[PDB]
Write a protein that binds this DNA or RNA. Structure first.
Ligand code: 6MP
Ligand code: 6MP
Lengths: 339, 339
DNA sequence: TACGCAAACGTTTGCGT
DNA sequence: TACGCAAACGTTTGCGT
């Protein structure tokens, strides 16, 4: 029941009970035992609430995610979770779905619940959001998904999604392609706009022109893939290859080509991005840019912890790097031999 | 800063401050305002810890999951999360990975953190686990994944995974198949053993015999799929159709057939189970048993809430039902016309 | 040597008048 | 009418002797 109850059974003071429970000071064996014994019949469970209340910290972190079912997301999340656990923390998962309201919502409940730090992955960042965010500069936090350091009041991990974008395009070019298309993810997010612009650089470098009929915005969702691909192959002249903003949307596009009896890579080449755990088992095996999701996990937790325990004041940023993963969805384009 | 600070700026008592903050009693407008005003410069945030401490409840639920990246899982989880939010709760996500230790681990931190209730999805349930579980009968909890009511000390939601198993087999039979195989998920879990036995019933009913060379245990993971399928098609005589324990493993098997240049459904028919969000976009579009994941979410939260607020004492169980979803991975078998 | 007193952390709420 | 006193919730920890 309560510490009081334990001391009494133990015939010792709560001060004692508490010290033997946190080994915060020496306690006689005979003493220690008894308390243990007491603890064990009474079936005592120390109240962290009580405790947080005195010590001023909850040993609990809050992840304000965008959605958590998405392959990408899920994957990072599981990581972060692995980190909180090994280091004694507790995860409070919370998805805002990109709903400002839902965002002020969670944010507040968190503060109130007095989470030691805050992990942030909101995908898009409008001023209004960035604004709410500042209001909480007091809480240690890191934004795991910016392309640049959006603000001064936080830690940041940076994925170099542009470098990724560029890598994807190059491979395409280097494989013999010149008629390429793209189904970008929303321009309102980094992994969206950033990857696209990375891709667009390489093209310019190649004096390659992407006809706008060949550009089709996705939402990271497989249906979006499906429809984009559809819309691309559903036209007179079609690219010989396509760079797809994320693997799930990629998967999306794979199904629509199969449905038009288009052959991949034989008829259309396909490059994705993220390298989700199931990508290898796409059909065919997906060729994609791999986003280090597990470090993006770890590096964020870490930065936070630092700030948390090392009472760090200054905002810091850590870069991370994507890297090409070669599979079976891409094939040589018409200009390979001429390179 | 603190309630004290607010009352002082407000020139009113904390009792007052608190009442205007929870509208727990009438407060003069002029009064109310001021407090609000105070609250707002001081930038006050009520401490839920403090609060839980007095009121005896955290308005926070704990989900002791198995893993959270898995499609299936992820999907339910997102649901549960949607429920805690709309009803004011807070989710504590925690994966045990089927590690007893990790399981005593989380379980304890939870109690300590004094979560109002406990959602449980541990996949396998050995005595040792069931044992730890009992120790916490005090905390309201429901096990979202049993096939039957494993114990008396909990709420239970039941999926009728056997009924699902049976439905899968029937379709197979009804479509003209008699040489069928199966890549079951681990017998140590419900969704494993249960679905398999459901499938096995129908076969007996059909006087169908499954050669053990045609049975191959998976782990719900795509590689397992891959290898199982591989091992099945890699033999003299092969089934004309296969019932796969879960969609991700199914996806697993799709990739290996493609790799052996086997045609699906043209060469091999494929039935999955779960109906994950991406299943439709498998290639081809997956035919599977759909597990209501979103209700399994909702119904669990609800039961808990009940127990929670309605201080319910008796363990209750709620059934849920799977239902065939027809796609493109199955085709008529050799005996269709003869039926 | 080994242990206890009592004050505090930030709230909520029964009784008041 | 409208508001305040003070005790409590379950711990931790500075000073003790
Ligand atoms: C915002 C977002 N959503 C889903 N998958 C993604 N991959 C990269 N960014 C993503
Ligand atoms: C235990 C388990 N893991 C992953 N996917 C599943 N589908 C049903 N049960 C599953």
């Amino acid at each position: 029941a309560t510490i009081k109850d334990v001391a009494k059974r133990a015939n010792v003071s709560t001060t004692t009970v508490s010290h033997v429970i946190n080994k915060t000071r020496f306690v006689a064996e005979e003493t220690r035992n008894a308390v243990w014994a007491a603890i064990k019949e009474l079936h005592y469970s120390p109240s962290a609430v009580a405790r947080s209340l005195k010590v001023n910290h909850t040993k609990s972190i809050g992840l304000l995610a965008t959605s958590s079912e998405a392959a990408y997301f899920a994957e990072i999340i599981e990581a972060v979770e692995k980190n909180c656990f090994q280091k004694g923390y507790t995860l409070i998962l919370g998805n805002a779905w990109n709903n400002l309201e839902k965002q002020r919502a969670y944010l507040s409940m968190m503060a109130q619940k007095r989470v030691d730090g805050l992990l942030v992955m909101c995908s898009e960042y409008p001023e209004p959001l960035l604004a709410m965010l500042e209001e909480y500069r007091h809480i240690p936090m890191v934004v795991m998904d910016w392309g640049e350091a959006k603000a001064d009041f936080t830690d940041a991990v940076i994925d170099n999604a542009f470098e990724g974008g560029y890598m994807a395009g190059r491979y395409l070019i280097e494989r013999g392609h010149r008629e390429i298309g793209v189904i970008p993810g929303p321009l309102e997010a980094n992994t969206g706009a950033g990857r696209l612009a990375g891709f667009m650089k390489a093209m310019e470098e190649a004096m390659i022109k992407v006809p706008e009929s060949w550009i089709v915005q996705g939402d990271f969702e497989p249906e979006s893939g499906y429809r984009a691909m559809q819309q691309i192959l559903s036209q007179p002249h079609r690219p010989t290859a396509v760079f797809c903003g994320g693997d799930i949307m990629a998967m999306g596009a794979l199904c629509a080509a199969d449905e038009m009896g288009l052959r991949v890579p034989q008829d259309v080449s396909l490059i994705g991005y993220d390298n989700v755990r199931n990508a290898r088992y796409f059909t065919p095996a997906l060729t994609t840019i791999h986003q280090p999701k597990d470090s993006l996990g770890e590096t964020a937790f870490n930065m936070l912890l630092d700030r948390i325990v090392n009472k760090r004041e200054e905002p810091q940023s850590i870069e991370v790097h994507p890297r090409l993963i070669e599979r079976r969805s891409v094939a040589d384009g018409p200009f390979r031999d001429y390179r």
